[model samples]
Target: TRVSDKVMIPQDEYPEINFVGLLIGPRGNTLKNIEKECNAKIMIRGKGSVKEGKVGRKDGQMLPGEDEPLHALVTANTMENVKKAVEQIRNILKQGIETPEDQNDLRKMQLRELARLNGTLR
Candidate 1:
């Protein structure tokens, strides 16, 4: 893979969640799983060190709720992997995390259907 083929995203569009701790879950398996799923590496630049770290809900930014200085940098083999990873993680940012298993399953199926639309699924 080319070292130059990577993208660093801003924190403005992210939905609100414990992204720093998200990078580290219980016993810290989250970041590893994210990297495994995205097939990329997420570099932790910092966490909540600036005013922009606050998510803008009133502005329509629709951010997952993390800031650049407060979020991270991810690099994958290709841009597709990066996008897939972001969307997959974004699914969790929405409400109803504890809603129900079927709902979660449906959400996953929806994500797959979207992938099919994008030609990532067949």
Candidate 2:
């Protein structure tokens, strides 16, 4: 799915604020490529199924119906320098640093630095 809309929360509410992306897929390749090529990390959550004909069905009749089987979710702490991050990751990978421990540490450091810069946490 595409970004149908977005609202920027006020600075005063920033502490409680979050960034989210709603992805519609089976066509998730676009989203995956974005994360990989742009170094954008996304959180994928599975929303409960959408019922078919529920909108047309009467109240009680809508109870048990087939699910739409779609995926919806939220992501956080993306970068302003997405391309740079992606390039950095690509360079690291090209250097053959593919160990899980290295990858974990790399991600952790990236996110921690991002959070500090963004004022997401002290």
Candidate 3:
């Protein structure tokens, strides 16, 4: 068999809206890009693969459960490609996915705070 490496990710750590879906993108475009760029075959498979958005819950965010074990597998010819693929995958998942609206709002909030601190917003 070929050198098939894997990176195990705990889904509970993410607990963001559409965490898996975001990584996969609308039509696997993001996954395909990662595979092409890293020159490796990528596969994300696990039990907690549901893509449910926000819902009415006691807490504002999704709670971590026992079935949060997720795995990202990468198969390549060489260890260099395998390691590079894992790095790229981690870079993509470092920050849990969020909507553009939320990202922009965060940037605007930070900008205002910085401006005020610098006496530019006064």
Candidate 4:
């Protein structure tokens, strides 16, 4: 439920970039639901780090396989494109639609729609 401490992660431990303060959830049905609803992958690990000094400097890091997929998705895109897509989605959210379900679907649509708009703009 609640994360209490900081986990130390090695700089090169992950296949992607170095990161601290990652929130990991459990595996199975609950995790599947979270991943589907959020349109992202989720991973759970048995061990956690609560290092005293600088976060992510400990000997062991969080599991790499659990984090690599999401990291790859994020790092594949350019900052400018990501920013534009986010801004577009924000504007859509501000409009205030009919219901919560509508809003959720709209948010997912906005990602792809915004990417198309960005491509056309360029």
Best by lDDT: 3
Give me the displacement of residue 78 in model 3, in angstroms.
1.1
Clashes of each: 9, 1, 0, 2
Sort by lDDT, best first: 3, 1, 2, 4
Q: Write the per-residue lDDT of candidate 1 for residues 72-95, one digit (tens) a residue.
A: 455677778777765544443331
Clashes of 3: 0
TM-score of 1: 0.43
**Model 1 CA RMSD to the hidden true structure, in angstroms:** 12.0
Q: What is the per-residue lDDT of model 4 for residues 94-122, given as tens digits with 9 covering 90 to 100?
A: 32231155465553332343335446222
lDDT measured at residue 116 in model 1 versus the true structure, 0 to 100? 58
Off by over 4 Å in 1: 2-17, 48-68, 92-122
Best first by TM-score, ranked? 3, 1, 2, 4
Model 1 error, position 89 (Å): 2.7
Where in model 3 is the C-alpha error above 4 Å? 15-17, 50-68, 98-122
List the global CA lDDT of all models: 0.46, 0.32, 0.54, 0.30
C-alpha RMSD by candidate, in order: 12.0, 15.3, 10.7, 17.0
lDDT per residue for candidate 2 within 5-66, as digits (tens), equals: 11221223321111111121222433464456544543332222222222333344333433
lDDT of 1 at 118: 53
Q: Least lDDT summed over 10 consecutive residues: which range in candidate 2?
A: 15-24
